[PDB]
């Protein structure tokens, strides 16, 4: 079969693999519809968790159940289905602590082009098909159900992990497609007002969409200045922080209220250290939070975000700016997220 | 000065008592705008929380500061203000350990009403004005603002209580003014599906506006088989209870996944217990954590629910359904709560 | 195989069943030490959880693998494991949302004696052994060991769950084996003063020795009126239940303060409902908040109290009052729990 | 009045004040014992938190009640008391946020040699008596009770800091006396296996005293390779930082599991930045969070550390090496904090 795939760091294209088989408690899975991420940017062309070789790209897919194992019960050939890009190994240590995320080590769960080769190829393996499969409703549509994967999840997981409470103000620093789901997700767990620092008007302009009170734009002045006018002084409750670079976090650092909570979702890409300043975090003491955490995945996680999208709760249709048509296309696509037009948040491509 | 009192257990009336004066930390307030509320018929009715004599009725108030102690620096004579039923003393062992609501002993945050004459006065006094008082902008309606100081703030409580996660399924029971308000709680805290269980028509159609997916009427059928027909025999993931008795418990219990959440925010009238059945707790054994707890209050929580307000992350004026005009019609519109016609949910009174 | 069985509610005796056969994830283990249980009364003797016909008995074991299917990684034949009471299906809805205990359905991760056949025979059946047996280090006496799979989890389970925090005043209702291990639990969760009621002399001379300041025997008074006196009408700051019946609920509402928690891991075997009294829990808000729920178990559970036994934190060997060897002794142990004499707190069988 | 003081950065002495006069909430205190803290070499020598021009130090004293102002309740002339480095002012927005620590402002909460003369004077002032002191009891003599102020709180926030669960693999870092007290601090929150990196042997002897099973010695190489090897690879559960520099947060990320919590307390008194190391940190991604707080303090805290001695939980004598009299030794005592010989945990000095 064909996929395509990180031959090395700094380079892609098409290659040639055996199809997989499923062991007995596995899927195979034809994508349906598929969307790059940012992600596998920094990955191939910052190699910013290491060399890969041959590795078929993609963490991103609605798709049919093609093939089950003889122990899977709940899924069967010709299912439609969200596949998280989060697929642990449910049994392992991590998982009886909490960390589903971290089974079998850290960032282990996410395995789809980390640690396995990825959804962008003719056919790809889901491991533990029960546990990390979910059925999709047919009242959503494809390209509204493949930002379920990963956009919604790890968007959500920033406010999660910002620890917002009601009517928190809360700022989003990045409102790519995670952040614009940072916004959404700060304004599910009641936050008041909500700032979203970003640059780009499209993105902007689908913030404020998604509950975002107050565009804060570098052209106003420093932005840790601009929102600490804002409050009168007081900065924020809480910060998520869903893009930018290494340096972000001494941003958030600043802005925010002593006693407190930064979330990160980002995944940074290059630079040896994030800096965290010693004076503006209370040299030591100032009770502002730090948590950087990669998103939640299996079947439940999806399920909840399913019955968000299904129930009216989320429309995470507006993030996707571009359609394309075709297994050729991933390349395309994928080509995009490296050079981002301006009215770009995320392309999908749909392959049946 | 003029004000609806509790004359004894059984009888309200309009008394005269002496204008009170602010100590150094306090102010007077003259209202603005008041509610009445179910508790309040509790108390004086079913004598739910002992005897009393001449003690001034309400605890839901818009107003005017007229008066502040010396000691008072962030509100003045003219400000306008949201007061919120719960006004503790800060000083206390029980606000060093995380509870205010009961600070000098339970439920001794909330003094309007219960320990200390309430707002349907021409004036009435709040303790510790920089703590208590928070500043009611212009923007937002006098009718609306009086739902802050009760019904927001335990609506949204109740839901808080209900420890409701992102795509849960979540059971409201009960969709009076509070019940309205934790249907709200439950979608701004990231609630999927939202059963409401109630059965006047009004207040069905409200709830669907703030977020009900599935309306449940007891005339229909037990309301627990009910909830597990709809839920294929799982259940729901949390229980906020916002109505009923002492019973509503164990319904709470027989519809809840084991692993769960019962937040209680009603305030139980009469009964000399609260049944919990044995064999659907688990045998004690089930982790459905049973919680139930007095609202917040304070100035910081009023600023909270007046940013939800004010950013239009909820609109609580569909609570109020009757308008009077003056004064005098306090006694009207509190024996309206005591006889609850059925397009009936929340009178305000807009004083002169 | 021989094994030690309920018949019916009501009957035990000695029955001959087939050996059991382990999957590809399960292992055959025999036992090497062995005790009874207060929830085996309950089950047998109240029909507390219903109805069984010729269900071996017994869920605290140390062991000896003898058998392992072919996808078992960790443990191997004449491998020595602590066995936990719960040994759930780990790759259900219930884990993926943090409640093993209760995976397949409340209580049934607790299968042991409960949903499968016990430890009281010549072999048992463990189910996913990589995932629910920990292995024994040599220096913990078997007697000590035995005391792991479910005094010691339970006991400290009470004490988590009753969310003790540093220098809290704690109340144990209930020295039994789980109680005085619940004393112990609240002295590793940071207790200051602890209130340990029982008025058995053993019992109350081991509480002291785990870390008990002050017995309460209810022949010197009403239990809470000795608490409220002891505490100067303040109360305690948390309870946990771990003995009594449906009525100990009451108490435990009536000695603590407003905005605490209850943590109840008593099984109860009787009574229709647990009343809590509407007053004294604050007529529905005085953030009393209660918990009940079975205990922990799965191999992460075992490894983390083996530390604690290893590194010498607790000596759960304190609890065994009467050691027997071999199986004709556990008939013996067994009836000794039934009809409870006054040194007794825990039996154990050694077995060849 | 006498007192010593910081004159200006790497400048102290011996200085003329006014003898402080109560407000109507306060105390004024003359100190029985007094201990010099590692933080005023920070403050002093370092310019850690910036200049200062005579500011009396010292921020750990027991005292005697010498005057009240007339609102004070429950203290009075004569009166023994703990006196808390942190004296909050109650009356503020970051009270009812939950952070007393930094009411009016980051760190606000330690004002004694911050931002409010010390108590290394003949008299010193505490606010707001009520919510600040608490009572010695005789029992605890005042060498033990000079422990309480700063290092038990501090420790034990460490610790609390760090999220500790029953048998969770810790490692703190730095043993002084916060370490010192973070080991008894973690053994207290239900710790199995705790690692406490220290050299000096005098720290390290008492350091298995208060709970400690494995000392790591820097001299001996690596300490994130020794705390590798000694867990198998895996890493710890949890850190505390109470010692160290800028550079310890990457050997806490470098040493922890992913998942995980770190908890610090050291005052850092040098350098820009704190560095994370981005790989080690899961590029973002690996759940290791990270925290950093100022230790509680009032009237409650003292009270649970009081019991906490009082009922023999935590012995803190044990870090009392040095006991001086007078206030011609308070001299001594600071520049024993700078110079640090090697039998030096904490010293006191009796001035009644
Ligand atoms: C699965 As990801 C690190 O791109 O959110
Ligand atoms: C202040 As109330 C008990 O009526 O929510
Ligand atoms: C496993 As049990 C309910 O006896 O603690
Ligand atoms: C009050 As301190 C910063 O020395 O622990
Ligand atoms: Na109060
Ligand atoms: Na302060
Ligand atoms: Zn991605
Ligand atoms: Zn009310
Ligand atoms: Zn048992
Ligand atoms: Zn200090």
């Known amino acids: 079969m064909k996929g395509f795939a990180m031959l090395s760091i700094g380079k892609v294209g098409w290659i040639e693999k055996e199809k997989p088989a499923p062991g007995p408690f596995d899927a195979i899975v034809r994508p349906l519809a598929v969307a790059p991420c940012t992600s596998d940017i920094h990955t191939v062309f910052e190699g910013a968790i290491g060399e890969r070789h041959n590795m078929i790209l993609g963490h991103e897919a609605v798709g049919e159940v ?9 899924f069967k050939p010709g299912d439609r289905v969200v596949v998280p890009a989060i697929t642990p190994d449910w049994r392992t240590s991590e998982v009886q602590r909490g960390y589903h995320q971290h089974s079998g080590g850290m960032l282990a769960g996410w395995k789809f082009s980390n640690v396995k080769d990825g959804v962008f190829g003719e056919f790809f393996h889901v491991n533990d098909a029960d546990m990390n499969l979910a059925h999709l409703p047919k009242e959503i ?7 379920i994967p990963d956009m919604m999840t790890t968007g959500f997981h920033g406010a999660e992990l910002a620890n917002i409470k009601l009517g928190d103000t809360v700022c989003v620093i990045g409102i790519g497609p995670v952040g614009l789901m940072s916004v959404a997700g700060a304004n599910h767990l009641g936050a008041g007002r909500i700032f979203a620092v970003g640059s780009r008007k499209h993105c902007c302009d689908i913030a ?12 106003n002045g420093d932005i840790v200045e601009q929102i600490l006018k804002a409050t009168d002084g007081k900065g924020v409750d809480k910060v998520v922080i869903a893009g930018g670079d290494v340096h972000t976090f001494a941003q958030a650092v600043k802005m925010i209220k002593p006693g407190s909570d930064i979330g990160n979702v980002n995944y940074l890409g290059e630079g040896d250290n994030i800096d965290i300043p010693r004076s503006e975090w209370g040299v030591g003491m100032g009770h502002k939070h730090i948590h950087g955490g990669l998103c939640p995945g299996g079947r439940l996680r999806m399920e909840r975000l399913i019955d968000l999208v299904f129930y009216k709760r989320v429309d995470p249709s507006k993030l996707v700016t571009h359609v394309f048509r075709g297994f050729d296309n991933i390349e395309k ?13 995320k392309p999908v491509v749909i392959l049946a």
Chains 1, 2, 3, 4 share one sequence.
């Open 66 to 74: 093609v093939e089950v194992g003889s122990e899977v019960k709940d």
């Open 208 to 219: 404020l969409e998604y509950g975002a009170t107050d565009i804060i734009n570098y052209k």
């Open 141 to 147: 549509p494809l390209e509204a159900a493949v930002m």
């Open 333 to 345: 696509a994928f080509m995009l997220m490296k050079d981002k037009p301006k009215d770009l948040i």
